[PDB]
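Objective 1b of the project was to move from sequence-level analysis to a structural picture of ligand recognition. The entry below was assembled by the postdoctoral researcher (A.K.) and checked by the PI before modelling. It contains the amino acid sequence of the target and the SMILES of the bound compound, zinc ion.
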Amino acid sequence: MQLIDIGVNLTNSSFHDQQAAIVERALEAGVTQMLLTGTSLAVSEQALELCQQLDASGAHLFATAGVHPHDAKAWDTDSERQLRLLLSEPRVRAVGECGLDFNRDFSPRPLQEKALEAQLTLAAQLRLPVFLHERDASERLLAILKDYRDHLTGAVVHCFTGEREALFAYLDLDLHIGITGWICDERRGTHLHPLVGNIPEGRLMLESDAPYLLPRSLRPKPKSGRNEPAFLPEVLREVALHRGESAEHTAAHTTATARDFFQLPAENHHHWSHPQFEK
Ligand SMILES: [Zn+2]
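Corresponding predicted holo structure:
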């Protein structure tokens, strides 16, 4: 039962340089490949450097490069050029995380749109798929994508949390959908239960978004409250259940989808990497 975690924020400070153990626990749990998410030029560089530092063969760790809407305001005159270079690294497999977040509004909206469009333009010219974030902005995101979609090899709406109409609109644009532990959240994720089954096989992928979105049904829960990619099987369990399919079958098809979407290569216990009650 191999799984692929399409979005790990493995450079996060909150991991306090314990990425090696985190990766070891993931592999041991059968999460055999992971996409390390870039959220700014600096964090995209660090994500790539982590792939290089931890995984010399290029079998397990890959990166995305992009600028997140929270950080769109840092998009500047040298951004396009630096990102184009980073994207041409072979371990870098997608453009993103990029998109729109009108809930937080941590960058002005026009600056968000500007950064998004420049990244979609790069994705189109470089023939790389897009890793999208959207929150309270489905209407703007759909309008923007309309002019790009025909020119993209593909795009995923990562960590989809919205309602039926938004889902079907994304599906109608032929977008992939990524599902996280938000689905295990009894307070805000139950509305996904009737929806996950509408995502065709071949368009559904899974992701932890670690350290965020620790599945609320997990046990034992880490005292830190940090999510990690080894907890992805709890997401698989819940997604399989509401799709009415075996865990083995959901695992198989999401993994095949992710391999294709990111162009990943085919397949082929330690005590130090399982500290108990870690800070
Ligand atoms: Zn996101």
